[PDB]
Amino acid sequence: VGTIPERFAAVVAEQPEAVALVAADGEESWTYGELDRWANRIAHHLHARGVGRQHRVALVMERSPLLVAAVLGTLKAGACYVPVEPTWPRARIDLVLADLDPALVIDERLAEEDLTGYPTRPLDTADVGGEHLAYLMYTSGSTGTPKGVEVSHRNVLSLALDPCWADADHQRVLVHAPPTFDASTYEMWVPLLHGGAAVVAPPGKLDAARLATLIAERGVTALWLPAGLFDLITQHHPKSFVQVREVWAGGDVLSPAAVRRLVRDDGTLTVVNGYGPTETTTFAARYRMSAPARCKDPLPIGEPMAGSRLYALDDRLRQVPQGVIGELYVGGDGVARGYANHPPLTSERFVADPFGRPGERMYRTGDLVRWNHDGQLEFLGRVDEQVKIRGFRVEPGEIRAALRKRDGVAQAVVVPRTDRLGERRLVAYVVPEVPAGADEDSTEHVEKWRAIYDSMYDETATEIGNDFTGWKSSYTRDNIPLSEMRRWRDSVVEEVRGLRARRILEIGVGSGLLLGPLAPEAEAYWGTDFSLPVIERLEVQVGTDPCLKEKVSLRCQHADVADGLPVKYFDTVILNSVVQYFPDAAYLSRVLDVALDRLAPGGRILVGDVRNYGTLREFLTAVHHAQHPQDSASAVRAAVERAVLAEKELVIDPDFFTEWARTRPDVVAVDIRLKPGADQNELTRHRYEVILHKQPSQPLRLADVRTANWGSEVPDLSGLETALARHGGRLRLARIPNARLVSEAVQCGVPTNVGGTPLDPHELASWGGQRGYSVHCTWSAEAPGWFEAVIIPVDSGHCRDGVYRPVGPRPRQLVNLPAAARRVSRLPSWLREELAAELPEHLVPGDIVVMERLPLTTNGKIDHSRLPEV
Amino acid sequence: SVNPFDDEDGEFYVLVNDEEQHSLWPTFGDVPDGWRIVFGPAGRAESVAYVEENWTDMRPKSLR
Ligand SMILES: CC(C)[C@H](N)C(=O)OP(=O)(O)O[C@@H]1O[C@@H](n2cnc3c(N)ncnc32)[C@H](O)[C@@H]1O
Numbered sequence: 034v035g036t037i038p039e040r041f042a043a044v045v046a047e048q049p050e051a052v053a054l055v056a057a058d059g060e061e062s063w064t065y066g067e068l069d070r071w072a073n074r075i076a077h078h079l080h081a082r083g084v085g086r087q088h089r090v091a092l093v094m095e096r097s098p099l100l101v102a103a104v105l106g107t108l109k110a111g112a113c114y115v116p117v118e119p120t121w122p123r124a125r126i127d128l129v130l131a132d133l134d135p136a137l138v139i140d141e142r143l144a145e146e147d148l149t150g151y152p153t154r155p156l157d158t159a160d161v162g163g164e165h166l167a168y169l170m171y172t173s174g175s176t177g178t179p180k181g182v183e184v185s186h187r188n189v190l191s192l193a194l195d196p197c198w199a200d201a202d203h204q205r206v207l208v209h210a211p212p213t214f215d216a217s218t219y220e221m222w223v224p225l226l227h228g229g230a231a232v233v234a235p236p237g238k239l240d241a242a243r244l245a246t247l248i249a250e251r252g253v254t255a256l257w258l259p260a261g262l263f264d265l266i267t268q269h270h271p272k273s274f275v276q277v278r279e280v281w282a283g284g285d286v287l288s289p290a291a292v293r294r295l296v297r298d299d300g301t302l303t304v305v306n307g308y309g310p311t312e313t314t315t316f317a318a319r320y321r322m323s324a325p326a327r328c329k330d331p332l333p334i335g336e337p338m339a340g341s342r343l344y345a346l347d348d349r350l351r352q353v354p355q356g357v358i359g360e361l362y363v364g365g366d367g368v369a370r371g372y373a374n375h376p377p378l379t380s381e382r383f384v385a386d387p388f389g390r391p392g393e394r395m396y397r398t399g400d401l402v403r404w405n406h407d408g409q410l411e412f413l414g415r416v417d418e419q420v421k422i423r424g425f426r427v428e429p430g431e432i433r434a435a436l437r438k439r440d441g442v443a444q445a446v447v448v449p450r451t452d453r454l455g456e457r458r459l460v461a462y463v464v465p466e467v468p469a470g471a472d473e474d475s476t477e478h479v480e481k482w483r484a485i486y487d488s489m490y491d492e493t494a495t496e497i498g499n500d501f502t503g504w505k506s507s508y509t510r511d512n513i514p515l516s517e518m519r520r521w522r523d524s525v526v527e528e529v530r531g532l533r534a535r536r537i538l539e540i541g542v543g544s545g546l547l548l549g550p551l552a553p554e555a556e557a558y559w560g561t562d563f564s565l566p567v568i569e570r571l572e573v574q575v576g577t578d579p580c581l582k583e584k585v586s587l588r589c590q591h592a593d594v595a596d597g598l599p600v601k602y603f604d605t606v607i608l609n610s611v612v613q614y615f616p617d618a619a620y621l622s623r624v625l626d627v628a629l630d631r632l633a634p635g636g637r638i639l640v641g642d643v644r645n646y647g648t649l650r651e652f653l654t655a656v657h658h659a660q661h662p663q664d665s666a667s668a669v670r671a672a673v674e675r676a677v678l679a680e681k682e683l684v685i686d687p688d689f690f691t692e693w694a695r696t697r698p699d700v701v702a703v704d705i706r707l708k709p710g711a712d713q714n715e716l717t718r719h720r721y722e723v724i725l726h727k728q729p730s731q732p733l734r735l736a737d738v739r740t741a742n743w744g745s746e747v748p749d750l751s752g753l754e755t756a757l758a759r760h761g762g763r764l765r766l767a768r769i770p771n772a773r774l775v776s777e778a779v780q781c782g783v784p785t786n787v788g789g790t791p792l793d794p795h796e797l798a799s800w801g802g803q804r805g806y807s808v809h810c811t812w813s814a815e816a817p818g819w820f821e822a823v824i825i826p827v828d829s830g831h832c833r834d835g836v837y838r839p840v841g842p843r844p845r846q847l848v849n850l851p852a853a854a855r856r857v858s859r860l861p862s863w864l865r866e867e868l869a870a871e872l873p874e875h876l877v878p879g880d881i882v883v884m885e886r887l888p889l890t891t892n893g894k895i896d897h898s899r900l901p902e903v
Numbered sequence: 904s905v906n907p908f909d910d911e912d913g914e915f916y917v918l919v920n921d922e923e924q925h926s927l928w929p930t931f932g933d934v935p936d937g938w939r940i941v942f943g944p945a946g947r948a949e950s951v952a953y954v955e956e957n958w959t960d961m962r963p964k965s966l967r
Pocket residue numbers: 172215216282283284285286287306307308309310311312314315316334400412421425426
């Protein structure tokens with residue numbers, strides 16, 4: 034005989050009056066005879082509805098006595114039973130049923146069906162053999178969709194007719210594992226094929242305390258228990274295992290301390306460490322703990338089962354010698370037929386066996402193993418990214434795929450983390466999708482800024498351009514001194530006067546800080562601003578003084594909108610400390626194109642007070658460590674990652690302006706430089722000026738000046754005099770550590786990183802001024818901490834190009850996305866809800882952390898150590 | 904190192920059983936008894952592409 038019904042028929046022949054099946058209550062119980070007749074009635078009912086040989090029957094049922102009857106009835110009809118968890122989401126249930134496309138779908142309504150009409154004799158049918166399918170069970174798939182393992186009758190009989198089961202230990206077995214999980218194959222067939230009793234535990238999730246009750250009260254002799262759930266029950270309820278003879282514990286690595294609680298020198302209770310994947314039918318290896326001396330700190334998975342054959346193989350498919358690590362391959366009669374509807378994946382994983390019978394195949398587990406000194410097989414982790422969470426086999430790629438196909442998400446990585454309690458769980462790091470040309474929230478982001486500025490400006494009297502409302506330091510939360518704010522303003526005015534401005538347009542005029550000093554000696558001064566309260570204040574202010582009444586114009590409109598502004602009239606457009614309030618890169622690009630149309634030939638756009646994206650992370654680590662000095666290095670990186678994504682102001686890398694200028698042929702010069710002065714604040718440290726000149730300006734080409742590194746080529750300022758002499762005045766000094774950021778770090782308490790011997794950009798300019806040079810300082814594309822300085826013989830020619838030089842292809846992220854900051858905060862909540870409606874609960878990760886970019890290693894692959902903790 | 908069955912930049916055969924079950928298999932190895940090579944030396948992508956086209960029916964010669 035070579036089928037499950039044939040072997041089950043042999044049991045009922047001997048013991049028709051013995052108890053086969055027991056309910057969760059304990060009140061009801063069925064004999065082998067009663068169970069056989071009940072199963073036959075189901076087999077006739079299935080035949081009436083069209084179920085024949087080699088058909089698939091989906092059992093969408095809870096764990097019950099009726100389910101045990103149904104699987105027997107399915108097998109008696111020559112069919113293949115496929116358990117489906119009814120507590121799964123409908124998305125997953127419909128996915129499995131679609132992939133399976135079964136002959137019939139039974140559910141809870143089978144209980145309501147009247148089976149008394151059908152006969153209680155055998156159905157006979159066409160003759161079934163060993164290689165016909167008994168069941169299908171679905172494991173987690175790396176691609177995204179789940180993969181059903183096709184298991185045969187002789188595969189089940191290989192497991193079920195191991196000589197180890199030929200005794201009274203499995204007289205009363207607890208059936209509590211889910212039907213979808215293959216431990217259920219052990220729980221059902223071991224007692225049912227040896228004259229034992231299947232004690233069916235009640236439906237749903239059963240905690241350690243609830244199992245401990247049932248084990249004791251039902252008089253359970255044998256058990257399956259997952260390694261995690263074994264550890265809890267054996268800690269809190271060791272008194273439950275008094276009448277238990279055998280406990281098979283596995284799934285994950287088994288705790289040695291957990292076993293020592295149960296096992297004693299008398300050896301009435303034996304614990305078995307059961308190893309095996311689904312593809313080799315439940316158990317492939319076993320290690321018996323009879324006495325406590327056998328419990329080692331390594332906890333070996335042991336020796337093979339009767340039907341199994343274990344091969345520890347190297348990268349060239351040769352058998353590994355003793356005490357050497359190899360990958361485990363499982364041969365023998367337990368090896369499954371393959372994956373349902375995936376022939377290439379089957380040919381990949383179910384491979385040809387060089388050690389077994391000619392035709393036979395060998396399953397590739399992907400588990401690392403080693404034969405120890407004693408000759409027992411040890412488990413030494415895992416090759417690939419597969420991991421087990423609360424007993425369930427999880428492939429992270431299944432999670433990644435479900436996340437990746439949602440709207441606001443580009444990439445994803447999913448990893449396990451061990452919590453403070455000890456239990457393993459998942460965390461998914463995801464990066465949001467960045468669409469070009471703004472979103473629906475872009476206009477809403479501008480309106481929030483307008484509403485903020487209207488409320489500030491409306492109500493809340495003085496002179497024109499001499500008021501600085503009050504700017505606070507991000508480090509201390511105190512006010513920035515007005516002497517520093519005056520110098521900040523005067524540097525911008527000095528630069529406009531230096532360019533010899535006549536017809537000016539200031540976009541985002543404000544209270545008139547630049548309008549006050551510049552408009553009196555200007556031919557024309559136009560000013561746009563989207564807040565109507567300021568325009569109406571300024572229109573009253575300029576109305577009093579008749580000197581600048583005819584000159585000045587004040588329009589209330591957005592920076593994006595060009596409507597009504599003079600075309601090719603102005604010689605300079607000012608965007609001073611306004612760009613930061615724009616929603617995205619496309620908006621900034623559009624306003625610059627608008628500003629370019631305003632300029633007559635020869636003019637320039639002056640973009641002032643631009644937040645540097647290259648040093649945003651070093652700014653935010655400084656602010657955070659200043660406010661929270663007790664926090665650890667991991668807690669800082671976690672907090673900074675949130676701060677970057679939560680930033681409501683627009684922050685631009687200098688490469689944006691060079692990229693912007695290449696498409697525009699009219700733009701002949703791009704002058705990017707650091708802020709001037711010796712003031713120590715966030716404005717001077719992290720902001721910069723950009724000047725963009727139109728076609729007939731004729732600039733100084735400083736892009737192709739001969740360079741020299743600070744660390745390597747020219748050690749000190751004495752060497753600079755020598756280097757400037759050899760190169761003949763024209764030299765640009767690179768890789769200079771920025772002393773402004775070093776001062777920021779020591780004051781805020783940040784460790785930082787750079788080379789030795791930093792220079793202050795202002796001191797370098799003063800140093801150059803003494804020696805007859807003008808030093809033009811700018812950012813380094815090579816590093817945030819570094820900065821470049823172009824040294825030229827002194828002159829008043831305010832028209833330069835290529836002061837900032839890009840290095841390598843780096844358009845990875847030029848600007849941040851403040852308009853999407855609110856959607857980023859909603860993603861962790863929203864994605865949990867989305868995956869909970871699609872996937873099983875164990876596949877839904879505990880926490881979802883958002884990041885602007887995944888930390889990469891130098892070679893290219895993902896850097897797991899940099900990923901922030903929860 | 905990487906596993907030989909997932910090598911990508913590697914040379915492969917496609918073996919078949921007496922029961923017409925296909926198996927991917929690397930060319931350096933000692934070919935097992937009771938398997939014959941149907942797809943001569945090739946890359947992994949084209950070896951995988953062969954199995955999709957040619958296996959089709961996954962039943963182990965019971966009726967098939
Ligand atoms: C009834 C058995 C335990 C069940 N068939 C099962 O868990 O198989 P699954 O397909 O879910 O995956 C397996 O889990 C890991 N594993 C199983 N027993 C283990 C043990 N005793 N120490 C460590 N890992 C073990 C293996 O890496 C393998 O991939």
